[model samples]
Target: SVGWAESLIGLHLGKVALITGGSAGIGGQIGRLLALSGARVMLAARDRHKLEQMQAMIQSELAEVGYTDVEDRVHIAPGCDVSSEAQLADLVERTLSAFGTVDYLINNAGIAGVEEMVIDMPVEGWRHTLFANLISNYSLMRKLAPLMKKQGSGYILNVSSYFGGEKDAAIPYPNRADYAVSKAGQRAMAEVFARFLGPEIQINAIAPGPVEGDQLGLFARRARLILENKRLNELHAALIAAARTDERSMHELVELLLPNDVAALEQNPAAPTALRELARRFRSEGDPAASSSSALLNRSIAAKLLARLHNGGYVLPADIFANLPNPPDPFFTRAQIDREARKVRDGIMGMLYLQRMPTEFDVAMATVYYLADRNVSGETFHPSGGLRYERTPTGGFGLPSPERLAELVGSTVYLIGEHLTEHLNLLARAYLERYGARQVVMIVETETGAETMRRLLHDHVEAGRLMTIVAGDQIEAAIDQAITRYGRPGPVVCTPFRPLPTVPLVGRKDSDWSTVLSEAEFAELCEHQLTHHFRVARKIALSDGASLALVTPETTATSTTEQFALANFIKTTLHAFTATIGVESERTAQRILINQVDLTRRAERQQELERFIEAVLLVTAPLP
Candidate 1:
């Protein structure tokens, strides 16, 4: 006699559910299912009439299903806007008065758009949207979670997805920053609630695609229009402007690379002499693009990216098109824009299997699943018509990124730190004389290393083939200055400090684990090991055509037990972080090489650390 949701949910006979936004759409569906399945339901929202209507409808549906126990099962807390403190608190107090205790909390309230304000827009203008959409959930969860934890069992669901909202975490739909922030925040709630609430409650957020029956007669129409406009409008405008403008001065390219045109000319700026230095590099060294036919397509794709940033919105300048014979304008029609926009959505649809937007029933079914499965807590449940997938074995974070090919010629390499300075010097010399490096600069952590290297390589320093900067307290500034100092950014090879956390897995004393495991101490350490290394990658003042090699010592892989387990754990954590950032680098930049040295002892086991150094250098070249 029970439906699919009820089949799993079984009975909530003596249970109580407080659902926000429960008078409408998905909220209504979940409320209906929960009430009819025997939970006492308190539906809360702004409109009184809708709340009354839904209450009546729920009871009517219960009667149709021939349930006599539905008499005092459903109630409404009408005229309650979740955003307001007074109203939300009143509703919670009323629900408690009606039903002695709370068994579940369903957070399902968010306005789809906050007038489409970008992140840079004024705060007051869109603060309500974030308050209503996100703050409501935070308030609700914080209030109820303690009670549920005390009760020793509970379940909660955050109905987070709202048309194009999930994409916010990926590529946010233009100026709807408020909507994106709130929606993504809801999904994140599941993770934290699970951590704080413990095992008693199963907390989950459903990331659906705009559930059926929108308040829209024009909602979906407006939704697609906005996303489409966001994508095509910006690029289309840029293409036309790029095609029309025939200015070929290196000034535009230089400004794009070094945006501080006026600031640089002022003498108090200490005269970096890098902007024109970089332009001279561009005109002389020539532009490096993708190889063969697909590489040519990449060049075309790159143009679309630049067009958006250059003309319409953010200022992401590109000189890759500087070498183009003529930037083509396809004379795009409105209809053709529709076809293009439609296919892009189609591509996304195809990319994720189970190709369709989810239904209200789908979301409700998922909520019921979370409520039923007590063990399933602190997780985001995507009822997105299958937006989830088992990713390829080689992809994703903390996993291996299959390496790429490159050579080390006619380029630049910034050798960072003097940890492995001896080997780094060898790489720098090989880069300058044999590998066709125009310049090789060493970024030293200390002035001692700086002067030491300067004296040893005085000839190369005088020749302008090798340079070193003492990056003392000003790590980011010094690294950025080094980038511009070299004229154009090329490849960066940074060395990590020696001996990465060597302690037992199950430590003996506080003294032994203090440096590695203690919160502030370990955090400060990784801030140098991981943070400083990534910080160097971001400070490329001149250009972004650089590859990064995060150097780690090959300490003859450690003992299985407590001996080097801590070290290996720390190293693996770094690998996982690096692997993910490498994916992002490859995706967004030109020729990404986050060269993480995996000392598998796979190559030349009969090897020296010197041999290990030689093996690792094979991948850092311009073309490998």
Candidate 2:
């Protein structure tokens, strides 16, 4: 059994020790351990600043202990990256001259290698891994082993991974062939060195798997990544087995296996089409299958995912994909990161749980124990906690659960306008059909439109549920009067309207955007658009759960996107205002679903206006 006491760790007191990768991680912890006993340490690492920082940290700790001569005792060997033979030689020569004799040599520096398959791995990956983990260790030992023998005796410890030992020799480390080979070489090097350095020098390797924060660890920045991903892979692989014979829906299977991922996305249980909107706006992307974490899931994969859900369709509603992030981050929001932090922890539990992952101090103490016991040599110590049983499951393009066609209809819809078009007239009629007898306040300018509203308003007086806001009347007063008159509204849908101005999709010249309204006229339209909506929301004291599905002009719909200078500016500003106000209103109450439909695109198609009507009803109806 391996054991460490303060006495054992102090065995190197007054002796000289050299540590590779001493700037950080396990090596840094080892330096802390040795420095406490007043051991003279030569710290070697690639980055000068990091080595200096670590050296300062050790010195401060030593100073706190009131240890004198602390400043010069811990020397930093900057630029001595173990992988370079020239650097290794320089490190050995420097340590010898500085300390006279090396009492302990700790080889903790190594690269985890590129995460690549055997066939796919580059030649440089294998070369770099071998040089850093194995060749460098051997270089240091051969250079100093004879010196140690001449001086009487010394100790050596090679930092390694369990993948090199018998515990993991049978189990595969997928996509880590280069790393495994190098670590195995490090393990063998210690054994081979023991026979040669025996009688005078003692050598051993400390092998641990998935050390705490192992994601980037001693490997720099890519350690915890492989560990995190391996856990993710386990969750994936678990799904592959359950999918074939399981009776539940794929969504259900996910809920069983990875509730955190679904919860992180805030996946809607009822309407799969709707999730927390934070994700809907998230353009963050990354790939589970690729190396980089720049953006979203692959574009082609998104297309196929959509197609799989809908077959032989008339134009499918964009609402079907509305809740899905256009480009998705694996996590819906940063707020969900705490849940993710637990995700990898739970994953490791499945991997090889021994109650907890090994702390860096654990490895440091192992180094201490092995160094003190010169009787023990050429052995590999496993501090992995336990065997890794879980390698990591589920497979598929996780498109959202099947979107069921549903519509929510209710609320007093206040549809106000300067002038009305046949499209607006159609929308009004569609609303009457859907939300029967709900109070609707209408503002129609044209004679025919006014006349048509009178007919409907007379009926709502009885059952048609319509009221008119005449031109002479102040809009806000009329809305207040109407609210006082009939307050039987549910979640209200309100919009200040005017027929949206249109421009050519590709506006080549100023003349191409010349619409009926000039720049001056556009301002009046926008003023009405803002004034009336505010009039309604203020007049009706919109309650909790109530929504103002604010309909906008041709910005989101229409044949062309360019609506001239003033018109474009007005719509964009209003849409921005709508979105910001929506964000603001989240705390107290009320929601403004700034909705636009391509009414003009499908206006001629008898069926398309129905889509437009359906679109309006969907946002206002749901109260989301």
Candidate 3:
């Protein structure tokens, strides 16, 4: 309905655009879009060199289409730290002096490294978030709003995020309190600007729910990993509890107590089921009332019994087991059941806590194109992609909820997940339901014996009863599928997920008391995981060839106590490595795309070489 080609009728042809953070990503894209649309752009950022490079690139791209006056139209005013008032002032002055006026103001500069457990996060990090994200936008607007007001016509776009303000924003990821606080501040300021800077100078906010960036992606992935580790530790604790409660083997205890229960029970299921099942097994000693549906059906009484059982001290009344028919086995005694039941309840509660965690997303260039329409003002828009949770059920919170998953993956999907399997499956199914005859290529891989694999593939495809089955590796299959569907094939490549390494959760003593890891030991664990498991894959993916894409799942990194320090390290490493791969590698370096997959479920875990060394490392830090 919205014709972009025609929408350009009301473009910013002779106007000026002032964009902060214009040196990179969405902001840079916005600057480029405005420049190509004939608006003069002032690219502002901390990195002067980066800003110049972006300006040059925009200019070069524009020149190909005969718009060669980019040098005159695009201006790079570098070294403007939006957080600082003086720098902002200098930026504004340069913009005004160069163009003689400001028509559009884009506040897109922000930082998000304030990721840590709320209580443990340093005050300095909080200040940085406040300054760079919230205060920075405020400062820029404070200086530019009056200028726009004086001009009597201008557009102000505040680049915001999904975390600025949402219902489950805080508790889901209590670690990202700083980021939530700062972003919430931005939303509030944007509202104020909309109210005041309205009528003539239009002001609006764009909340790009979750955009992909090297550092932000790394942070999100690690935070999820840390939560996963914590979940595993909780499971470990529950295992210990189960071990202590029963004289039988721990495996037996687990099998009996941890049966496949509804991942998310409506209220509580274990207690009532355990009670009824026990009564049925001890029917001779059991009172008729024990199995009476009427008695069990009473919600209030059932809740009371469950609560008591959860407390680990519940006792069945003697009257409930009247005349004795048979002696009860000591192993399946009421007390043992009660203990195992408590452990089960504890494990579910721990998993629930983890399932409720949150992750936020970012913006993309397509959104920048949408912002071109002048009608979009005084309102906030969320342009994110859909969120996906694991389809399988596992003890460690494999179940994904639209409600609970949002806490961990943020409120917006924005740029990612467009062509993901789940989304594609939905589209394909919908198309088949409505119409018919849809060509879909199912990509498969093999570790060895390509011939055997192809035979198996063909057998399955033939049994499924259709015409075609192209069985081969990524390249051959891609070429075949392309010809089969579209009559032509493009350059084909393989993208793979790198396996994550495991680390010890406790020290050499392996005691429950030694759960927490020291800062140094935590860092060593991360480095060890990355070096041993990640490096080879990265080396292969970053090499010269067809485009290489590597996917890193969120659960690969652990979020243990001492490991929080590695958050910043991981971000820096990802950013530097990605940057190097892009800049220092081959002419096709740009072909390398590192896709860090977020919103993943728990993955499959490890051991102590020397318990004594673990004991030593337990008390002391691990060496580099």
Best by lDDT: 1
Query: Over the stretch 519-616, how does candidate 2's per-residue lDDT look in tens digits?
Result: 23433443455434434443333233344555544433433433433233333223322333343333222223333222222114545556656665
**Candidate 3 has what TM-score?**
0.40
- Per-residue CA lDDT of candidate 3, range 1-624, in tens? 143433332365788888888898778877877776778889998898899899988889667645656688899888877666677779889998899778888888877655543222334565556567756665665556555666566777777655454311211223454565455445544553454456556766776544434333234444343433332223323433444444655334333323222222112343334333432433433333322211211222223223222222223342332232232222133433344445534443344423322222124345555556666555666665333311211112122233432232111100111113332233223222322323323332333322333343354335431122233323323333434453321111122212222333223222332333332343343333222113322223322222222222223254532223222223222322232333222221112333221223222121211221122112111111
Cα lDDT tens digits, model 1, 443-514, are 787878888777766778999888888887566667657655665556677776334454321222222332
Better of 1 and 3 by lDDT: 1
For each candidate in the order shown, give its overall lDDT on alpha carbons.
0.56, 0.54, 0.43
**Which candidate leads the pack in TM-score?**
1
lDDT of candidate 3? 0.43
Reference-based TM-score of each model: 0.48, 0.45, 0.40
Off by over 4 Å in 1: 1-10, 46-52, 62-73, 77-91, 97-100, 111-136, 160-196, 207-358, 379-624
Worst-scoring 10-residue span by lDDT in model 2: 392-401
Give me the overall lDDT of model 1: 0.56
Question: Whose TM-score is higher: candidate 2's or candidate 3's?
Answer: 2
Q: What is the clash count for each candidate, in the order shown?
A: 8, 22, 20
**Candidate 1, residue 543: lDDT:** 34
